[PDB]
Design a binder for this molecule. Structure first.
Ligand SMILES: O=P(O)(O)O[C@@H]1[C@H](O)[C@@H](O)[C@H](OP(=O)(O)O)[C@@H](O)[C@H]1O
Ligand SMILES: [Ca+2]
Length: 336
């Protein structure tokens, strides 16, 4: 401990604008449990849902690239090619988007694209995966620094089952403790973290109770029975993560190709299985499901603005030393 050093950091904090520049980066986060459906570029409603500018960074997570009943890199690459074609298709003049990196754990995959113009700012990209224990479930994560701000993205597919939310909570803990990038870096060591996917948490009511409530728009009532909300409220899972209020209907269990909830004999209770949660000072904007019908789940997305800082380290070290000396001499004089 050094009092003079503390003093300097305190003062310097007041003069940050002298060695720091701040910028807002737009980030589009998209999630889709595919039920093993084929890759296609017909995703416009999902990836360009709003009448707003294209994002700087697109973070796309898929579950069940192979329908669940050994990891297919080929199928993941078809999706990569489809997303890239779609993003560049909107870039009629000049530079488009490039894939920074992708990762995969069995049927779960995460791929991140950014504008070519963002590339010079992106550094220390790392990726890792972690399977769940208590198998085809788990997480895929990619992190990177954008100038001097650290971001970490995680997509997952957690334990399936109507009542086994204790196993999903266990999966959360397994992944939060188990995901490690280079040199033991954890997911929490970042300014912004977005963790999302098919967490599989369910609404704890019966099919016959839930369906008419959905049809009647009683989403607030149903959310009172959502297992994820219940476990987050107690700090048991995803502590310090936030979720925007859900204004869209349960994204799971639909007959494929239709607006109809599961009419199979399995009469699966609808649920908000697909979620996007964030930790850190992101500014959230949208959070919605989109009407694509290729799977028994609807895809979802969330948008954010992320404040980025670029620090002139050289210029800051100089001010620091100057302020530090000035203060040490001041204390010297006071002793005289
Ligand atoms: O594979 P799907 O289409 O997601 O269907 C799953 C099903 O496979 C079981 O894992 C299950 O039942 P259980 O109640 O016995 O845990 C769960 O409720 C269903 O939603
Ligand atoms: Ca499925």
């Amino acid at each position: 401990y050094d009092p003079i050093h503390e003093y300097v950091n305190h003062e310097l904090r007041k003069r940050e604008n002298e060695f720091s520049e701040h910028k807002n980066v737009k980030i589009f986060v998209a999630s889709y449990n595919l039920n093993g459906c084929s890759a296609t570029t017909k995703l416009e409603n999902w990836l360009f849902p709003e009448n707003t500018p294209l994002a700087d960074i697109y973070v796309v997570g898929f579950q069940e690239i192979v329908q669940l009943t050994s990891a297919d890199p080929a199928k993941r690459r078809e999706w990569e090619s489809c997303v890239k074609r779609l993003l560049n298709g909107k870039c009629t003049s000049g530079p488009g988007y490039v894939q920074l990196r992708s990762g995969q754990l069995v049927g779960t995959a995460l791929m991140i694209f950014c504008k070519e113009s963002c590339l010079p700012s992106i550094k220390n990209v790392e990726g890792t995966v972690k399977k769940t224990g208590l198998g085809n479930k788990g997480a895929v994560a990619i992190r990177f620094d954008y100038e001097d701000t650290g971001l970490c993205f995680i997509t997952s597919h957690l334990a399936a089952g109507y009542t086994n939310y204790d196993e999903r909570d266990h999966d959360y803990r397994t992944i939060a403790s188990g995901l490690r990038f280079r040199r033991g870096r954890s997911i929490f060591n970042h300014d912004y973290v977005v963790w999302f996917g098919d967490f599989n948490y369910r609404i704890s009511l019966t099919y016959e109770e839930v369906v008419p409530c959905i049809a009647q728009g009683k989403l607030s009532y149903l959310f009172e029975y959502d297992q994820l909300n219940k476990q987050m409220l107690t700090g048991k899972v995803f502590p310090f993560f936030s979720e925007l209020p859900i204004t869209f209907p349960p994204t799971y269990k639909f007959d494929i190709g239709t607006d109809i909830y599961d009419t199979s004999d399995k009469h699966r209770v609808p649920a908000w299985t697909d979620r996007i949660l964030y930790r850190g000072e992101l500014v959230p904007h949208s959070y919605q499901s989109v009407p694509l019908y290729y799977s028994d789940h609807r895809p979802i997305y969330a948008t954010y603005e992320a404040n980025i800082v670029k620090v002139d380290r050289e210029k800051k070290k100089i001010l620091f030393e100057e302020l530090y000396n000035q203060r040490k001499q001041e204390v010297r004089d006071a002793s005289q």
